[PDB]
Design an enzyme around this catalytic site. Structure first.
Site, PDB file in Angstrom:
ATOM      1  CD  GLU A  88     122.908 -46.251  -6.393  1.00 59.88           C
ATOM      2  OE1 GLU A  88     123.767 -45.903  -5.691  1.00 59.88           O
ATOM      3  OE2 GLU A  88     123.251 -46.915  -7.318  1.00 59.88           O
ATOM      4  CG  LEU A 115     130.402 -53.751  -8.119  1.00 58.05           C
ATOM      5  CD1 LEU A 115     129.633 -53.004  -9.303  1.00 58.05           C
ATOM      6  CD2 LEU A 115     131.718 -54.126  -8.741  1.00 58.05           C
ATOM      7  CB  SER A 130     125.045 -27.538 -13.660  1.00 55.35           C
ATOM      8  OG  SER A 130     124.803 -27.638 -14.853  1.00 55.35           O
ATOM      9  CG  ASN A 141     122.883 -25.348 -17.116  1.00 51.83           C
ATOM     10  OD1 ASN A 141     124.134 -26.313 -16.975  1.00 51.83           O
ATOM     11  ND2 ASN A 141     122.788 -24.575 -17.953  1.00 51.83           N
ATOM     12  CG  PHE A 150     125.941 -43.161  -3.724  1.00 49.37           C
ATOM     13  CD1 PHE A 150     126.008 -44.664  -3.624  1.00 49.37           C
ATOM     14  CD2 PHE A 150     126.424 -42.307  -2.928  1.00 49.37           C
ATOM     15  CE1 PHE A 150     126.631 -45.131  -2.226  1.00 49.37           C
ATOM     16  CE2 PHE A 150     126.894 -42.652  -1.743  1.00 49.37           C
ATOM     17  CZ  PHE A 150     127.163 -44.182  -1.426  1.00 49.37           C
ATOM     18  CG  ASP A 202     125.252 -53.135 -11.494  1.00 44.01           C
ATOM     19  OD1 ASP A 202     126.037 -54.134 -11.829  1.00 44.01           O
ATOM     20  OD2 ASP A 202     125.208 -51.814 -11.860  1.00 44.01           O
TER      21      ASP A 202
END
Ligand SMILES: COC(=O)C1=C(C)NC(C)=C(C(=O)OC)C1c1cccc(NC(=O)NCCCN2CCC(c3cccc(OC)c3)CC2)c1
Length: 461
Positions: free
Chosen positions: A221, A242, A327, A342, A314, A230
């Site tokens: 990130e 945020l 998955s 997967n 996230f 962003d």
């Protein structure tokens, strides 16, 4: 007395004790010499290791050979001086080692909490070792004061008309005085501090797991110290935190000055960013556990694989990760290789491959090998595991002699037999082995020392 000890045991023990001398005395003196002359390798932890192996040099010289020889004889041939020193110098050594190991655990704990700004001037370590040695000499004093060397044995010794036979034994004010001293010594100076040492190393491990999750998101990130707009169009700071969906920069700046509780002016520190990221990690974890789809999957996973899931929350959100139905099913069922296939067949993988490839590799291997940039986290993991193993080896080594000594302090009436002397030598040797665990764990497990001891031994030729 009907006593008979075999020379098949005596010589085998003499070889074993002699091996623990040449491995101990040399190894502990090598550890000191290396750390001392090799400046900048002499850090707070290493200075306490030099102090630890210095005490293990004393018990090897002043206590080790004198106890073995006395056991095989019905009289003390080393004088009142060596007699009184034997329990004292041994007690001081156990105590110094205990407090030096305590201090190492506190230093390691301060490093995991604050590694960035922790620049310790060694003077606090020199203060520590001085306080440790004064505390150790003081607490051990009654052994020196109450150990006696008299030619009047309690029991019948073999006759020698030409010399006066002396016996080295403990002569405390009374059995309650000895037992009271010994039990609070064993409880407050052995069990007590050790419990605290393990408490610190657990706390170290726990804070290291949360900082490993920080390094993962830092690489993905991205860590930014200034308020940035962003992809969404809203204002963020640090690792995807945020502030507000409001388009005014001053309105968004007001949320940061409220979240931190300090006049930031759009700029925050590396430590300030980690504090808010950890709050978001807890908020995400709270949500994952509130999420029926993601709760059994999170609970199934280990510390490393739970971090891969948190990284995904996230990025995509809770509704995002929940969409990986088959998955997550495979990850829940521990099919790491099937799930890696997967998770790569997704729209998430095609769009952000660089991040996905890393997250997937972590969900498959269960290790930080995907995030190879984080080698700083891998090194201190090895150091703390070695330092914990030194404490355990110290505790285990002394444990048989500590039991032998207390058992015979409560059962002081019992007469020493050939079976007792053999059991005592097997306990004494195990305890004496602790002098060797300091250089072997700090040599054969420490990367810096193994190459350095070879480039010193072969250099001497
Ligand atoms: C902070 O931690 C400590 O200080 C200690 C620990 C952890 N670990 C050891 C090995 C200690 C030690 O070597 O301290 C100097 C002391 C300690 C602890 C408990 C109890 C004791 N008791 C005594 O020394 N009693 C005094 C009587 C000692 N005798 C033990 C039996 C021995 C003996 C020898 C041969 C045959 C026998 O059969 C009956 C008995 C003769 C000396 C010491």
């Amino acid at each position: 007395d009907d006593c008979h000890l075999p020379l098949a045991m005596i010589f085998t023990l003499a070889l074993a004790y002699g091996a623990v001398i040449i491995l101990g005395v040399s190894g502990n003196l090598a550890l000191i010499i290396i750390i001392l002359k090799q400046k900048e390798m002499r850090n707070v932890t290493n200075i306490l290791i030099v102090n630890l192996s210095f005490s293990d040099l004393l018990v090897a010289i002043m206590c080790l050979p004198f106890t073995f020889v006395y056991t095989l004889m019905d009289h003390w041939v080393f004088g009142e001086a060596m007699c009184k020193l034997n329990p004292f110098v041994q007690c001081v050594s156990i105590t110094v080692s205990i407090w030096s190991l305590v201090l190492i655990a506190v230093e390691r704990h301060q490093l995991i909490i604050n590694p960035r700004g922790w620049r310790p001037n060694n003077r606090h370590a020199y203060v520590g070792i001085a306080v440790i040695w004064v505390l150790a000499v003081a607490s051990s004093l009654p052994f020196l004061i109450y150990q006696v060397m008299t030619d009047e044995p309690f029991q019948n010794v073999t006759l020698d008309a030409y010399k006066d036979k002396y016996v080295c034994f403990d002569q405390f004010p009374s059995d309650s005085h000895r037992l009271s001293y010994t039990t609070l010594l064993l409880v407050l100076q052995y069990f007590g501090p050790l419990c605290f040492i393990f408490i610190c190393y657990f706390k170290i491990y726990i804070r290291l797991k949360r900082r490993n999750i920080f390094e993962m998101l830092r690489i993905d990130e991205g860590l930014r110290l200034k308020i940035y707009k962003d992809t969404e169009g809203y204002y963020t700071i640090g690792i995807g935190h945020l502030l507000t969906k409001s388009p005014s920069l001053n309105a968004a700046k007001s949320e940061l000055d409220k979240a931190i509780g300090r006049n930031t002016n759009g700029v925050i520190t590396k430590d300030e960013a980690e504090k808010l990221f950890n709050q978001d990690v807890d908020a995400a974890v709270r949500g994952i556990l509130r999420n029926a789809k993601l709760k059994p999957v999170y609970d199934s996973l280990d510390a490393v694989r739970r971090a891969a899931l948190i990284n995904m929350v996230f990025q995509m959100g809770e509704t995002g990760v929940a969409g990986f139905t088959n998955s997550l099913r495979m990850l829940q069922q521990k099919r790491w290789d099937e799930a890696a296939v997967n998770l790569a067949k997704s729209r998430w993988y095609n769009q952000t491959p660089n991040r996905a490839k890393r997250v997937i590799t972590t969900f498959r291997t269960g290790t930080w090998d995907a995030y190879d940039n984080k080698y700083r986290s891998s090194e201190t993991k090895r150091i703390n595991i070695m330092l914990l193993s030194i404490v355990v080896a110290f505790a285990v080594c002394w444990l048989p002699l500590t039991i032998f000594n207390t058992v015979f302090d409560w059962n002081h009436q019992i007469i020493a037999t050939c079976n007792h002397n053999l059991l005592f030598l097997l306990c004494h040797l195990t305890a004496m082995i602790s002098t060797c665990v300091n250089p072997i764990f700090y040599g054969f497990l420490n990367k810096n020392f193994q190459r350095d001891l070879q480039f010193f031994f072969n250099f001497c030729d």
